[PDB]
Amino acid sequence: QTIVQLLSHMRDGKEIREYLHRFAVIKVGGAVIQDDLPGLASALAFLQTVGLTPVVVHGGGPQLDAALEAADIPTERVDGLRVTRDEAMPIIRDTLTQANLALVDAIRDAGGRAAAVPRGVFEAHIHLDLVGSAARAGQAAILACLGETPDGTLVNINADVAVRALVHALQPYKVVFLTGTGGLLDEDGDILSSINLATDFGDLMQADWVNGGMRLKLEEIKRLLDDLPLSSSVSITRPSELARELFTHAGSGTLIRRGERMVATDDKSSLDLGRLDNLVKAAFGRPAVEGYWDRLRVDRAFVTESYRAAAITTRLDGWVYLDKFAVLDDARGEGLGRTVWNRMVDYAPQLIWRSRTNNPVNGFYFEECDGAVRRDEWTVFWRGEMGPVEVADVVEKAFALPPTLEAP
Amino acid sequence: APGVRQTIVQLLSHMRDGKEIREYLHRFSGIDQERFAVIKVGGAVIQDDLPGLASALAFLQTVGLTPVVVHGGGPQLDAALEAADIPTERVDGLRVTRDEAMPIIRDTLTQANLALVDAIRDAGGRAAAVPRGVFEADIVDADKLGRVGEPRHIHLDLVGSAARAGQAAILACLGETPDGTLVNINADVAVRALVHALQPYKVVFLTGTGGLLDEDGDILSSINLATDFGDLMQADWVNGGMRLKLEEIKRLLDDLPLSSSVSITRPSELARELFTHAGSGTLIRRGERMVATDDKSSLDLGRLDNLVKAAFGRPAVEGYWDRLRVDRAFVTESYRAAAITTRLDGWVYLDKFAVLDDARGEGLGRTVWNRMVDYAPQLIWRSRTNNPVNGFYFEECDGAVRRDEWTVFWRGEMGPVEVADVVEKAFALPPTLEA
Amino acid sequence: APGVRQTIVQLLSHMRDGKEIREYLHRFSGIDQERFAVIKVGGAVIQDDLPGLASALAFLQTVGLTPVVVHGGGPQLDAALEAADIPTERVDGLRVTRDEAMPIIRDTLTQANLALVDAIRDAGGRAAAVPRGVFEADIVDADKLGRVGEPRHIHLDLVGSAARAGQAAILACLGETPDGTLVNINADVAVRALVHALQPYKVVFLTGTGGLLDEDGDILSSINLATDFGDLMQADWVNGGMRLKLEEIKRLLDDLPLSSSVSITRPSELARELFTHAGSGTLIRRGERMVATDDKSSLDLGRLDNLVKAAFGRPAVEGYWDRLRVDRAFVTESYRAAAITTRLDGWVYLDKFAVLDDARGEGLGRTVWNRMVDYAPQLIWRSRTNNPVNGFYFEECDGAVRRDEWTVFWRGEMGPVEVADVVEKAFALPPTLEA
Amino acid sequence: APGVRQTIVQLLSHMRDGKEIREYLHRFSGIDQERFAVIKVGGAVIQDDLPGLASALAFLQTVGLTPVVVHGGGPQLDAALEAADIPTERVDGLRVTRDEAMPIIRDTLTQANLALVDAIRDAGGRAAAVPRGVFEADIVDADKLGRVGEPRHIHLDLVGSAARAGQAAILACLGETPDGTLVNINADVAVRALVHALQPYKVVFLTGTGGLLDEDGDILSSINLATDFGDLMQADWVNGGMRLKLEEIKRLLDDLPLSSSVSITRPSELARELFTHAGSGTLIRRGERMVATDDKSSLDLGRLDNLVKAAFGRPAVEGYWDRLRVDRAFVTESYRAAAITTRLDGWVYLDKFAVLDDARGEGLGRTVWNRMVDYAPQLIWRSRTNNPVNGFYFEECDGAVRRDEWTVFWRGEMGPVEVADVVEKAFALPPTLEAP
Ligand SMILES: CC(C)(COP(=O)(O)OP(=O)(O)OC[C@H]1O[C@@H](n2cnc3c(N)ncnc32)[C@H](O)[C@@H]1OP(=O)(O)O)[C@@H](O)C(=O)NCCC(=O)NCCS
């Protein structure tokens, strides 16, 4: 399993290489245990080989409400969320217990290791003993949504509350809701890929199209993400997408983060220049030249709370010019580089910049530019529309700008 | 998976007991999944010898077997329960358990469960925590014994699940009523019920003491219930507690096929008890009746002749059986062990003691030998110096004269000058076997 | 093994540069018996970059592959020698070993050999020391050269005793005359023989200089002998020192099937170089010839159209090949790579560039692309904004403009003013492929 | 290593011989794995029982023990030389191998080398081929003997490389001069050189007849050289071939630490030889000198009292050593084995036989006991009934009478009337050690 020095060659797995060299709570919408046991199983098995310890929470599918509403015991939603009855425990018990063991077997029959924990975790307060027991043997802990009081009586508990408590106690890296409808929908009703809570939670709540169902579905996901490190994330895909949505570039599911406060200012004195200076020296090979910060004339500075990512804009013959874009390695891990770049370009639809031709960020610049002139040491990029005449001239000035860092 | 199996194979086949062990393993393969062995172990063992316990169990499972383990936690919940200021009431049963005690009982038995699972994995084994989900019980006692339960059904689902994954199933004695209510099961009935649902080949009680003791304070090697059980209950020497364990083991064995057995040892001895004929600890079987007679005509001589031929290698000399006189014959019902006496100048003389390896290991050789010496308090016999059985005879003898080829033993406390002449006679006897 | 394969294939089971690695891992399970790879390593690369060398070498193991490694003396044989006596040199190179200079060679090659074998093991791999017993040599006029030998036979017994063991044969250039007399053999003479006997699919040279530089001074990523050799020998900026290595390399590759290749890079990049189409370092192959013509009557339009359809997921629209007015067409003689150029308002215009991945992997796309841009120092062209070749195109462009669907590129000394219009005509040209 | 070392031990713990094997492992758990054993295999064995040889070696290797194996393809080479011809010359004391015979001594040895390496791998073991590089040698008598060498230096680099990786180093007796001249090494001078260099714990000689023989034709189970060597060397029955082996084995052992030992055995019995204190082989130690004396004042009684306290669990009753009247005393230099004889109504009566467990396993209990019974052909003694040394006592007696607390044994030609008498007396004797 020494699969870590083998991938220090490729593309995006270097960020899985700096967490594989440094786990995942899954809520399963029960409407999918009956559905695709084998595929949901293939997912959790794969999840382990890439060093995530699945801790799965499952309820009943419609298969349980229908077994109930056919025994003449309609549970209904109890005008709360769920789980109301007395005559129902035997059925709930056995419908959950069979489903639980079904999964433990499937995961194994898809290569992964597992552990049936039908009972003894949730109270009515978490006992993680059986969980850690499984984690300690590299086992997926499949947990049924069956709970008990202190004295031992069986009570049915709410998956949402069990998930919360479990996420609080474990501090998982990743939280995953597997649903049949894999992703939140935007305004058009398309698949809303990325939510940055603390840089778009305020808009989202006020937003008209955000019905009360998502309105508090998100207020909850926030409570989860708030109770975790910033490195954590809540994915929302579905079984047959899990792989692509956990670290890689595709994931046709939603990816909520907590994100951090963003500084956008035009006042150089409001910025910690030494923190920025360390950010640049750490992000690039070498440090800023002597007097660089002293001489700097800020147009806009975009700097995330933790000073691990920043874009400093200046003015070049009136054209917005990007003077500095610096992201620490383990903050590109949490999307900060992107949050900063995005906010910056929202500000500057027309933008000029340059990069040393052998800089590794160039692919990204090329991806992002609307035009580019290449030369032996330097490439100038732009976005926004403009005339051959204009750009020619501003591109000439950009190439003539004196270096802002020393060394190779 | 590849390194383990393979290297245990071309392993032990170079070890001392390796042959004997492969042979027990290969046979024990009446797998039916979790039909190998139910092992009871008290909490006092999980508390006083956890490394040892775990190792012994880990060994079984790395050698092919899949023990289902059931554990108590007496010392554990005596401590944890006094610490939480809750008194115990041993009313007409073994202890009432009121609502206030449950949380403690649940957590203490769950802790101990996990400890034992974890320890097994640390020993290199594979083990599943199953503190709940197997015993469904009725709560028949509510006012009288609180929350104690009688196992009404055994759900083996989790046991079967673990076994398939090749894990030892570690079960605690917590049950669930039919409505989901948590319940305390006493370890005796819990074991009875599991043993009845699994019908295992082997039941094993792991104790710190490691065996039942005879009248002399020695470990009683084996018990043949078909012959020894009456005697053992109507015996003044057998303490009240051992009487109970005896009647309980009887109860268990009665509800199993004839091929099953109970063993009683300590963890450190578990392997030698399971995989040697020798054993170590007490072995208990339902067993077979045994015939004592003075009449040769009521004996199956071709059946015996086969026993004698297989026990020693070479056969009986021609005319041996139609000429044999016969003072007394003691023959186990299956003809796999027999003692035949004749008379030597007036003395009782053991002319044949023949036991097949498997019967030796079941303890029928012992059984035949004991009923024989009860008959013949004074006894003469001989044996080749090569006979590996000589160690046993020496333990059993009251005297011995060794020679290059033969060794005369005698039993019964007469003196050297009194047997001197019958010893000379026994030496001069003709071989009763060819080769 | 069961904890190695399917996890490395399951990572590649659906990703990026993993459609092509899983492709290389499959080809590479072809004749594992050690016709896989001879890997020559400079004497120096085992002082400077020993841990990186090891880990590179070990990765190949964890992935199935069993390279035969040959190592030199270099900085070792120099220092350790002169610390006693004055060395000399008579033959073209082949140092010289008087006779009493041998004992040092043996122990020093052995040291380095074991040092390498240990370092690989420490890094997680499997290596066998084969400091001797593979090269059988002849003495070359003793009185002038001493104890330096020419390979007469190659014994592969100890090399297959690793191939069978899954370890990586680490070979020292030590030999023995037909009468056991230890002898010194020369590095790449020894490689020549090893390659001749094993006929590797791959022959890799490791150096601190991660490859071969070109006119500008970049790592020249590939050499197609059929079309590049003369060009490179008759070359100016190819210093005589580079010419030794091409002669040698051509030599080795002529003694190999057309599917083989040489690879000269740095240990850190060896994997990129072996398991990706783009590699990382200098790849050399015997290759294959190509046509450069401006007559459209001389091309197989049927063949080009099947390659375009195989290169992109779609075929040219009806009547394209009909009305195509070639300026220049550059076609590799297998037709697995091609560049076709038309004339756009007086500009040279790259109209089609098509390479099957196979040909991409083996440097034929580069060959075709280079002659083309040498013919057209000033080119215009476009590509779909989401085409992976855009990476290559950017590395090769002097300027670009990107809209949502198309991207226009150019080479040459033009600024945005001189090309503004033709770029605009290029964005407006019609598709030449189906949906 | 620590990862596999744990599991292998857990298994072995619950084996009958788990203890001793566990103990070899811990001994060699670190960075001297090649100092476990040098194993010499006779030419025959590779010819006849290759498959068993291989399985033996592969057993040791599977438990974590890396032998350093040396072979000299004897018989199969003899024939190979009868093949190409020119085979005879045995001038001095060794064979003489001329320039003509070399190219094929090589190929034969180098060949068996691979077969053995490959058998071990097949049998589930791990093994490195080391046919050349280790033995450096000065060429002996250029003329009279030819291309033969006396080892001058031992290069252990390759061996350590093998050990370090957990492979058994398989070494052929091919030498080479400092001027790189391949040469033929004598197999026994080869082992001596290697043993000197590695300072192994075990030196094993695998043979097909596996085990040395005594006068009566029985396997000679152990030799304690400090006390046995001289006798063995002057005994009529000890022949010339065997005398030669003892001479050589004594040299090996005089140059190793005290804890080292030589085993001579059959491949099929290797495990039982190293890991039990049984086995069909002969065990040989440098051993321990031993007094036999009638002189109580020449003995360290304090030490004997401590021997007695460890052997049995209690010290002698007050006044025992003061009162003692020694008939004859056999005490081993280290006081870990002792037999003390007294006089019982004139009969020789063994009053003490005390042997610590380690001494027993070294064969010192046998050294003392055998010397003692040589001196007292007629002997009476007693022993508590629950004494585990009783099985051995029975194996040694000519008769025995058993009672509840005690059992009286005797050896010697003795009439019923006699025995009865002295036996009655021995049962009556008072206990010599304070009670349990
Ligand atoms: C900017 C220039 C390169 C031309 O392009 P353009 O017409 O301005 O179009 P743009 O590139 O500005 O707009 C598209 C771009 O922004 C983005 N974009 C537009 N809508 C988007 C959306 N809904 N979601 C995500 N990205 C979007 C794209 O990602 C794209 O660039 P990309 O291909 O690198 O991904 C220009 O420098 C040029 O030379 N034009 C000259 C003007 C003229 O009229 N010339 C005629 C002769 S004088």
Author numbering:
A (entry chain Y): 10 to 31, 40 to 141, 157 to 440
B (entry chain X), C (entry chain B): 5 to 439
D (entry chain A): 5 to 440
Which of the paper's sentences describe this entry?
However, in Xanthomonas campestris and some other bacteria, these reactions are catalyzed by a single bifunctional N-acetylglutamate synthase/kinase (NAGS/K), which has been proposed to have evolved from the fusion of ancestral NAGK and N-acetyltransferase. We have now succeeded in solving the structures of two NAGS/K enzymes, from Maricaulus maris (mmNAGS/K) and X. campestris (xcNAGS/K) that have substantially higher sequence similarity to vertebrate NAGS. In both crystals and solution, ngNAGS is consistently hexameric, while mmNAGS/K and xcNAGS/K, as determined herein, are tetrameric. Each mmNAGS/K subunit has two domains, the AAK domain (residues 1–290) and the NAT domain (residues 292–441) connected by a hinge residue, Gly291.
